């Protein structure tokens, strides 16, 4: 015995499906200027009665939030099976003593 290689033979991924299976959106962080992929929690901006028709229907101009905190969509939902937008501060977000 003795001998003994590493025996990796793949590794990487490939074409990956649009969203559909999954849900998540190509974030542009403006602070830094980092590019992320952030996973959407609310497609809502905790607004009342959307006058655009928003009926929880991601579009241009919608703010979504996520783990790294408000997104705003800046491309319709299917651009290269993608969503892409801009990170950014829209919602009021501190600590309640419960």
Same mark, same amino acid.
């Given at each position: 015995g003795d001998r003994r290689v590493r025996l990796i033979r793949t590794r990487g991924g490939n074409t990956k499906v649009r969203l559909?299976?999954? @849900?998540?959106?190509? *974030?542009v962080d403006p602070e @830094?200027?980092? *590019?992320? %992929?952030a996973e959407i929690r609310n497609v809502v901006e905790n607004t009342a009665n959307p006058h655009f028709v928003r009926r $929880? %229907? %991601? @579009?241009?101009?919608a703010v979504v939030e996520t783990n790294l905190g408000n997104v705003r969509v800046t491309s319709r939902p299917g651009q290269d099976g993608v969503i $892409?937008?801009?990170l950014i501060r829209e919602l009021e /977000? /501190? /600590?309640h003593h419960h």
């Open positions: 559909a299976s999954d @849900t998540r959106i190509n *974030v @830094t200027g980092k *590019v992320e %992929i $929880n %229907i %991601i @579009t241009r101009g $892409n937008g801009v /977000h /501190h /600590h």
